[PDB]
Design an enzyme around this catalytic site. Structure first.
Site, mmCIF file in Angstrom:
data_model
loop_
_atom_site.group_PDB
_atom_site.id
_atom_site.type_symbol
_atom_site.label_atom_id
_atom_site.label_comp_id
_atom_site.label_asym_id
_atom_site.label_seq_id
_atom_site.Cartn_x
_atom_site.Cartn_y
_atom_site.Cartn_z
ATOM 1 N N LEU A 22 0.799 -1.090 -0.190
ATOM 2 C CA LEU A 22 -0.010 0.029 0.051
ATOM 3 C C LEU A 22 0.780 1.401 0.115
ATOM 4 O O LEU A 22 2.043 1.065 0.474
ATOM 5 C CB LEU A 22 -0.925 0.006 1.382
ATOM 6 C CG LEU A 22 -1.832 -1.186 1.432
ATOM 7 C CD1 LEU A 22 -2.607 -1.240 2.677
ATOM 8 C CD2 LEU A 22 -2.601 -1.497 0.254
ATOM 9 N N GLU A 30 -8.056 0.094 9.421
ATOM 10 C CA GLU A 30 -8.503 -0.101 7.925
ATOM 11 C C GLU A 30 -8.572 -1.656 7.689
ATOM 12 O O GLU A 30 -9.580 -2.026 6.897
ATOM 13 C CB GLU A 30 -7.618 0.946 7.256
ATOM 14 C CG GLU A 30 -8.465 1.324 5.921
ATOM 15 C CD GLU A 30 -8.599 0.528 4.883
ATOM 16 O OE1 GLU A 30 -9.874 0.408 4.415
ATOM 17 O OE2 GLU A 30 -8.042 -0.571 4.591
HETATM 18 N N1 LIG Z 1 -5.316 0.240 -1.576
HETATM 19 C C1 LIG Z 1 -6.342 -1.032 -1.843
HETATM 20 O O1 LIG Z 1 -7.330 -1.014 -1.562
HETATM 21 C C2 LIG Z 1 -5.455 -2.290 -2.483
HETATM 22 C C3 LIG Z 1 -3.938 -2.026 -2.896
HETATM 23 N N2 LIG Z 1 -3.569 -2.837 -3.772
HETATM 24 C C4 LIG Z 1 -2.208 -2.764 -4.235
HETATM 25 O O2 LIG Z 1 -2.407 -2.240 -5.480
HETATM 26 C C5 LIG Z 1 -1.597 -2.855 -6.442
HETATM 27 C C6 LIG Z 1 -2.568 -4.121 -7.187
HETATM 28 O O3 LIG Z 1 -1.774 -3.922 -8.136
HETATM 29 P P1 LIG Z 1 -2.398 -4.208 -9.680
HETATM 30 O O4 LIG Z 1 -1.118 -4.242 -10.636
HETATM 31 O O5 LIG Z 1 -3.314 -3.413 -10.075
HETATM 32 O O6 LIG Z 1 -2.586 -5.846 -9.874
HETATM 33 P P2 LIG Z 1 -3.641 -7.080 -9.842
HETATM 34 O O7 LIG Z 1 -3.972 -7.595 -8.473
HETATM 35 O O8 LIG Z 1 -4.709 -6.543 -10.321
HETATM 36 O O9 LIG Z 1 -2.949 -8.182 -10.539
HETATM 37 C C7 LIG Z 1 -2.559 -7.975 -11.766
HETATM 38 C C8 LIG Z 1 -2.451 -9.407 -12.470
HETATM 39 O O10 LIG Z 1 -3.859 -9.894 -12.162
HETATM 40 C C9 LIG Z 1 -4.259 -10.823 -13.526
HETATM 41 N N3 LIG Z 1 -5.552 -10.003 -13.683
HETATM 42 C C10 LIG Z 1 -6.001 -8.882 -13.423
HETATM 43 N N4 LIG Z 1 -7.387 -8.772 -13.799
HETATM 44 C C11 LIG Z 1 -7.590 -10.031 -14.391
HETATM 45 C C12 LIG Z 1 -8.670 -10.272 -15.124
HETATM 46 N N5 LIG Z 1 -9.864 -9.315 -15.184
HETATM 47 N N6 LIG Z 1 -8.632 -11.588 -15.645
HETATM 48 C C13 LIG Z 1 -7.588 -12.458 -15.432
HETATM 49 N N7 LIG Z 1 -6.260 -12.113 -14.946
HETATM 50 C C14 LIG Z 1 -6.431 -10.718 -14.395
HETATM 51 C C15 LIG Z 1 -2.929 -10.493 -14.389
HETATM 52 O O11 LIG Z 1 -1.986 -11.684 -14.121
HETATM 53 P P3 LIG Z 1 -1.593 -12.506 -15.314
HETATM 54 O O12 LIG Z 1 -0.573 -11.773 -15.980
HETATM 55 O O13 LIG Z 1 -1.120 -13.799 -14.526
HETATM 56 O O14 LIG Z 1 -2.982 -12.975 -16.419
HETATM 57 C C16 LIG Z 1 -2.347 -9.212 -14.124
HETATM 58 O O15 LIG Z 1 -1.136 -9.158 -14.568
HETATM 59 C C17 LIG Z 1 -0.527 -3.631 -5.316
HETATM 60 O O16 LIG Z 1 0.496 -2.658 -4.879
HETATM 61 C C18 LIG Z 1 -1.314 -3.879 -4.197
HETATM 62 O O17 LIG Z 1 -0.748 -4.015 -2.931
HETATM 63 C C19 LIG Z 1 -4.301 -4.154 -4.205
HETATM 64 C C20 LIG Z 1 -5.789 -4.223 -3.729
HETATM 65 C C21 LIG Z 1 -6.211 -3.093 -2.949
#
Ligand SMILES: NC(=O)C1=CN([C@@H]2O[C@H](COP(=O)(O)OP(=O)(O)OC[C@H]3O[C@@H](n4cnc5c(N)ncnc54)[C@H](OP(=O)(O)O)[C@@H]3O)[C@@H](O)[C@H]2O)C=CC1
Ligand SMILES: Cc1c(Sc2ccc(F)c(F)c2F)sc2nc(N)nc(N)c12
EC number: 1.5.1.3
Length: 186
Positions: A22, A30
């Site tokens: 985060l 939170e």
């Molecule tokens: N502040 C908060 O509420 C939250 C914070 N976070 C933070 O935010 C960031 C999350 O990062 P983010 O890059 O957006 O990544 P995601 O969690 O979305 O992961 C991205 C990967 O997930 C797979 N993915 C995403 N969407 C799909 C889909 N619809 N179908 C199939 N695969 C999918 C793909 O992997 P593949 O390449 O293997 O297909 C993609 O490369 C991190 O720093 C995390 O810690 C995350 C959640 C909430």
């Protein structure tokens, strides 16, 4: 299967992540809220489903994986099976949701919670239907490399109150934050 929901914590500049964590220092309460909102079913003997991307999964501390009391579903097209400790693996948001229509899942799942990251939120948010957003406003700027998609306020109405959601400003480690719920139905 009941409601579909997104839940996110977001800084003032729309940040949700940095370098896999985060943007801000940990806020226990939170996280506590997150865990309570995502875990709590409104239909006993039923469980909630959490849907997250691959990077989100791995950004959760291993001791908190799977998120306990919830069905954990991870989205990936590279993986060939769920990660260690996860339950389900799907290749698209449609597939995960369509997967909640299978006989097995349908009668075990109450709320579906999308718990990040940016692409899964954007798709859900822009899809027609009934969808709530539980948004925690972290009330400052933080350096970020992953952002929350635009909330179209013509569609998403900010609710004036919601059961089980403290309304007023909170503070932990000197960082003020506020719980919000948004709803659309289109
Ligand atoms: N502040 C908060 O509420 C939250 C914070 N976070 C933070 O935010 C960031 C999350 O990062 P983010 O890059 O957006 O990544 P995601 O969690 O979305 O992961 C991205 C990967 O997930 C797979 N993915 C995403 N969407 C799909 C889909 N619809 N179908 C199939 N695969 C999918 C793909 O992997 P593949 O390449 O293997 O297909 C993609 O490369 C991190 O720093 C995390 O810690 C995350 C959640 C909430
Ligand atoms: C997934 C999540 C968490 S868990 C978590 C932990 C460490 C990280 F680097 C990351 C996480 F995503 S806190 C939280 N709060 C709100 N309001 N909404 C959410 N979707 C989450």
């Amino acid at each position: 299967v009941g409601s579909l929901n997104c839940i996110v914590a977001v800084s003032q500049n729309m940040g949700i992540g940095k370098n896999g964590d985060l943007p801000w220092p940990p806020l226990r309460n939170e996280f506590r809220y997150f865990q309570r909102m995502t875990t709590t079913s409104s239909v006993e003997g039923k469980q909630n489903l959490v849907i997250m991307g691959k990077k989100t999964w791995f950004s959760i501390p291993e001791k908190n994986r799977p998120l306990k009391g919830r069905i954990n579903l991870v989205l990936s097209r590279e993986l060939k099976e769920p990660p260690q400790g996860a339950h389900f693996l799907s290749r698209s948001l449609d597939d995960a949701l369509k997967l909640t229509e299978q006989p097995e899942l349908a009668n075990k799942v109450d709320m579906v919670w999308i718990v990040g990251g940016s692409s899964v939120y954007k798709e859900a948010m822009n899809h027609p239907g009934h969808l709530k957003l539980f948004v925690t406003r972290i009330m400052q700027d933080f350096e970020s490399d992953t952002f929350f998609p635009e909330i179209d306020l013509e569609k998403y109405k900010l609710l004036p109150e919601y059961p089980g959601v403290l309304s007023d400003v909170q503070e932990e480690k000197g960082i003020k934050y506020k719980f919000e719920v948004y709803e659309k139905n289109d």
